[PDB]
Amino acid sequence: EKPKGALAVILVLTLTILVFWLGVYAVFFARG
Amino acid sequence: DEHKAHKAILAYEKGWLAFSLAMLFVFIALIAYTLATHTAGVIPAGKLERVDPTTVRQEGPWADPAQAVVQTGPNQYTVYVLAFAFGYQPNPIEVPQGAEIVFKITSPDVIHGFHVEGTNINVEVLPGEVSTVRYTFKRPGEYRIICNQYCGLGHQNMFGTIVVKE
Amino acid sequence: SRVYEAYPEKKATLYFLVLGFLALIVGSLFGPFQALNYGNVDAYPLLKRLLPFVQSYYQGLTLHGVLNAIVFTQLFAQAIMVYLPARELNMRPNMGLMWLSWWMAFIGLVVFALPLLANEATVLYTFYPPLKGHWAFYLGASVFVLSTWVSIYIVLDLWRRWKAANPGKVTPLVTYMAVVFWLMWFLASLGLVLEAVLFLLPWSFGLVEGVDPLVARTLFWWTGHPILYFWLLPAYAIIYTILPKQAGGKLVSDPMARLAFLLFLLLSTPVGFHHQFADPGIDPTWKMIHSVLTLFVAVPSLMTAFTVAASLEFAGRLRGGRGLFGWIRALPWDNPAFVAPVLGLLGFIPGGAGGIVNASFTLDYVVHNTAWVPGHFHLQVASLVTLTAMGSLYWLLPNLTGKPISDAQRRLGLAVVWLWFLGMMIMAVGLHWAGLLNVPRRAYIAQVPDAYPHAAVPMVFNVLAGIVLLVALLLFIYGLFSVLLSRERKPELAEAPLPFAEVISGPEDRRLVLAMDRIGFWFAVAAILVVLAYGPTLVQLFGHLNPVPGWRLW
Ligand code: HAS
Ligand code: HEM
Ligand SMILES: CCCCCCCC/C=C\CCCCCCCC(=O)OC[C@H](O)CO
Numbered sequence: 096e097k098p099k100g101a102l103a104v105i106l107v108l109t110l111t112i113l114v115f116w117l118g119v120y121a122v123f124f125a126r127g
Numbered sequence: 128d129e130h131k132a133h134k135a136i137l138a139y140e141k142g143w144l145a146f147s148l149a150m151l152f153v154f155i156a157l158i159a160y161t162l163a164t165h166t167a168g169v170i171p172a173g174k175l176e177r178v179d180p181t182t183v184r185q186e187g188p189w190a191d192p193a194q195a196v197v198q199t200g201p202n203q204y205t206v207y208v209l210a211f212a213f214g215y216q217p218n219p220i221e222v223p224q225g226a227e228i229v230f231k232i233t234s235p236d237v238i239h240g241f242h243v244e245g246t247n248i249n250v251e252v253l254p255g256e257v258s259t260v261r262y263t264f265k266r267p268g269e270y271r272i273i274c275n276q277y278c279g280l281g282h283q284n285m286f287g288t289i290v291v292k293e
Numbered sequence: 294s295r296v297y298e299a300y301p302e303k304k305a306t307l308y309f310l311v312l313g314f315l316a317l318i319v320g321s322l323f324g325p326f327q328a329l330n331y332g333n334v335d336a337y338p339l340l341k342r343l344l345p346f347v348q349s350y351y352q353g354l355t356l357h358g359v360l361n362a363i364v365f366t367q368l369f370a371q372a373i374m375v376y377l378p379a380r381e382l383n384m385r386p387n388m389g390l391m392w393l394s395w396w397m398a399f400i401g402l403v404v405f406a407l408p409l410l411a412n413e414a415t416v417l418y419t420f421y422p423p424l425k426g427h428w429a430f431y432l433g434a435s436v437f438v439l440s441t442w443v444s445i446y447i448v449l450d451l452w453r454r455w456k457a458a459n460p461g462k463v464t465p466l467v468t469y470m471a472v473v474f475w476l477m478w479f480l481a482s483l484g485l486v487l488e489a490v491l492f493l494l495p496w497s498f499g500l501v502e503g504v505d506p507l508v509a510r511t512l513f514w515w516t517g518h519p520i521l522y523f524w525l526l527p528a529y530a531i532i533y534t535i536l537p538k539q540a541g542g543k544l545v546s547d548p549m550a551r552l553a554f555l556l557f558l559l560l561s562t563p564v565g566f567h568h569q570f571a572d573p574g575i576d577p578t579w580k581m582i583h584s585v586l587t588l589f590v591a592v593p594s595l596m597t598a599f600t601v602a603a604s605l606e607f608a609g610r611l612r613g614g615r616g617l618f619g620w621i622r623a624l625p626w627d628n629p630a631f632v633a634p635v636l637g638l639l640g641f642i643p644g645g646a647g648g649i650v651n652a653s654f655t656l657d658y659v660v661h662n663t664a665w666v667p668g669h670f671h672l673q674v675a676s677l678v679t680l681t682a683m684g685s686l687y688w689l690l691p692n693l694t695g696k697p698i699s700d701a702q703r704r705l706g707l708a709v710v711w712l713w714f715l716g717m718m719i720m721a722v723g724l725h726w727a728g729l730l731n732v733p734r735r736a737y738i739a740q741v742p743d744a745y746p747h748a749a750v751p752m753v754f755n756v757l758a759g760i761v762l763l764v765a766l767l768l769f770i771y772g773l774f775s776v777l778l779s780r781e782r783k784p785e786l787a788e789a790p791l792p793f794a795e796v797i798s799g800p801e802d803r804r805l806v807l808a809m810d811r812i813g814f815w816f817a818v819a820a821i822l823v824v825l826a827y828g829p830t831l832v833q834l835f836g837h838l839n840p841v842p843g844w845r846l847w
């Protein structure tokens with residue numbers, strides 16, 4: 096049917112990437 | 128079952144690979160934006176500017192720390208900073224707020240970092256070369272310079288100061 | 294043992310592993326001390342009583358870097374990416390060469406160790422000029438690294454011999470991994486070889502007064518990035534081709550695994566300027582290009598995350614797990630060989646997230662040279678790589694020695710693996726956070742105890758990780774020596790097959806596998822991209838060399 100577990104894993108990975116990236120990018124501008 | 132699982136896995140992987148590529152492309156676009164704004168001044172001028180680290184303290188713009196701040200524009204100052212073991216000259220560096228500051232940093236001895244706490248200024252300082260970066264200080268007060276490149280036993284205690292006047 | 298008469302490759306592999314692990318243990322001793330340092334606690338006077346040759350925090354940090362990140366990881370790479378293709382093809386490696394590779398490593402290490410231990414090369418594992426180490430450090434490091442060239446020849450040998458016996462057949466999976474891996478490494482290595490031969494060696498020998506710091510850093514990071522993948526890929530070979538079996542399942546796609554590896558061959562070297570975002574005299578347009586390519590080199594691991602995840606799910610579904618969480622509990626959580634790499638993969642999520650931030654050019658000015666970097670890479674190498682290596686003790690050691698793993702030793706393996714994992718997670722929080730507070734890396738901060746008051750909270754995580762990791766390490770030392778020096782031997786374990794996974798059913802893309810198999814073509818492409826990504830900058834730098842005198846500041 097569909098690999099729901101894999102998707103869940105790459106979901107956590109995407110969110111972690113996004114929080115880290117957007118987090119740092121906010122920081123960059125605050126210090127800009 | 129196995130045959131189906133494999134088709135389903137591969138099909139969703141392709142979706143994921145496309146999404147991941149997109150996200151990465153967006154970041155590329157969000158970085159290109161930073162390149163277009165004033166915040167990019169902290170990126171080093173990638174132009175080579177050789178100097179002699181053995182005479183840099185005797186002759187040239189780094190020889191007299193009290194004259195290291197030069198007005199080079201209507202609203203621009205250039206600072207000739209020397210990062211050395213284990214300190215920075217001048218100490219303090221004194222610049223006006225709202226003015227564009229072109230830091231020209233070099234080293235007499237080994238490599239040092241020039242990391243201005245509270246700001247995006249973060250540049251390796253190499254002996255024999257001049258590091259050029261730009262920043263406009265928007266808030267007045269006292270900013271600490273940290274050396275973030277190992278430079279020997281005096282590394283952890285190597286600090287400097289920037290005073291940004293109103 | 295007559296098993297070593299028929300498979301002498303086992304004995305050589307063994308020697309690579311043990312020397313690797315010995316180097317890990319010695320390097321790791323400085324770790325808890327460095328962790329307590331970033332927790333603003335000074336336990337160095339204690340360390341100097343136990344180890345009186347240690348003159349400073351920075352000598353310790355040097356040994357820690359060289360021994361953990363250079364020596365162990367290379368010895369593990371040479372162990373894994375020689376022996377695994379050897380078993381998959383069922384062929385003998387050139388045994389004269391394999392032994393020559395070991396001695397080179399051992400000799401190179403000893404010679405480098407001497408100045409390191411005598412405080413004559415406190416330069417760090419990056420040894421940036423003008424900090425000037427003893428010639429024996431550069432020479433010993435060089436001979437140690439060049440050992441890999443002999444490894445490269447070995448696998449290319451095995452591969453060519455197989456292709457002759459088997460024309461019209463595609464390269465087997467593990468061998469395909471190893472071939473692209475070693476050819477990737479050859480291109481990557483040239484940066485440091487050039488740096489040692491042209492600059493560092495003659496300079497340390499007295500033959501030249503100075504070295505140009507910019508060119509050295511530029512040549513260093515030519516090798517410096519792909520070396521990170523050089524550490525990573527051996528763990529990946531296991532994660533892809535062995536871990537699925539250990540987990541109770543199969544590898545879901547052979548072609549995807551090949552694609553990841555092929556991407557690494559292509560994209561691992563032309564990216565070094567991402568270690569040079571804060572360097573002068575390197576044009577920004579070039580930094581942007583490298584940044585983009587670095588983001589690309591993230592694709593093979595994003596791909597890996599899915600292929601591996603799906604393989605783990607498949608295994609958990611086979612073992613009866615239902616829903617979207619149940620496949621996780623269904624996995625063999627009592628088996629340290631399964632647990633160690635899976636935990637390492639977990640921590641790799643924030644690890645790779647921090648890498649993607651670092652690669653982002655301007656965003657790097659935020660974290661460059663702060664505690665963040667160490668926080669980032671302990672997730673990558675000190676966790677995922679190290680853990681996968683620890684977990685192989687439980688299958689590889691018995692395959693190489695015939696020595697059994699008792700229930701007790703297995704339970705101790707679990708404890709070690711968890712505590713190491715959790716210690717690394719805790720330290721990661723402390724270092725990323727402190728990094729965001731502008732705490733510098735490579736610093737004896739505990740000796741400036743009022744310098745970073747804002748870091749008080751992340752500092753408590755650092756102390757915690759320090760003590761947790763010390764215990765993990767002590768348990769690892771005890772556990773490793775308990776298996777290596779165990780009395781009983783059972784030669785039927787040494788003659789058992791490696792737990793290589795099967796590939797799940799379903800037609801692959803034959804065309805893609807064949808395309809990927811055109812290895813000479815991909816090697817040339819890889820080489821071209823390096824000429825395009827480094828040629829212009831390096832031509833400019835070599836035209837404008839400015840060598841400066843060296844310093845010893847320790
Ligand atoms: C072996 C170790 C290494 C890996 C791999 C690694 C990967 C990355 N790095 Fe890095 N890093 C940088 C960027 C990257 C990028 C973009 C990635 C990427 O390749 C990462 C991509 C990975 C992912 C996108 C993660 C995918 C996750 C997976 C595959 C796990 C999934 C979980 C599963 C499947 C399990 C779930 C199962 C269940 C049961 C639930 C840059 C800059 O652009 C710098 C310099 C920063 C500065 O300013 O100095 C840097 C510096 C370092 C240094 C310091 C060098 C020094 O001493 O100065 C080291 C040692 C290091 C190591 C390593 N690095 N890195
Ligand atoms: C018992 C576990 C260990 C602990 C507690 C730990 C602790 C530390 C900390 C706190 C630092 C930063 C020190 C500083 O920036 O001044 C560091 C540096 C380092 N560690 Fe470890 N570490 C451990 C094991 C390992 C392992 C297994 C590796 C990878 C194989 C390793 C690779 C690195 C490298 C490459 C450096 C950077 C050295 C440099 O900047 O010159 N660590 N570690
Ligand atoms: C399927 C849908 C396709 C559409 C998907 C589109 C992706 C949208 C994401 C980001 C937008 C980028 C916005 C760039 C503007 C950045 C401005 C900023 O961040 O400002 C900083 C600061 O205020 C200045 O001084």
Ligand SMILES: CCCCCCCC/C=C\CCCCCCCC(=O)OC[C@H](O)CO
Nearest residue numbers: 122126244245267268269270722726729730
């Ligand atoms: C799990 C991870 C936890 C995440 C926690 C992250 C906390 C740090 C966030 C942002 C730092 C932003 C840096 C900006 C510093 C501003 C301070 C300032 O203004 O100081 C200098 C000024 O000159 C005084 O006069």
Ligand code: CUA
Nearest residue numbers: 239274276278
């Ligand atoms: Cu100057 Cu560290």
Ligand SMILES: [O-][O-]
Nearest residue numbers: 517518521648
């Ligand atoms: O560099 O990862």
Ligand SMILES: [Cu+2]
Nearest residue numbers: 517518521568
């Ligand atoms: Cu890199």
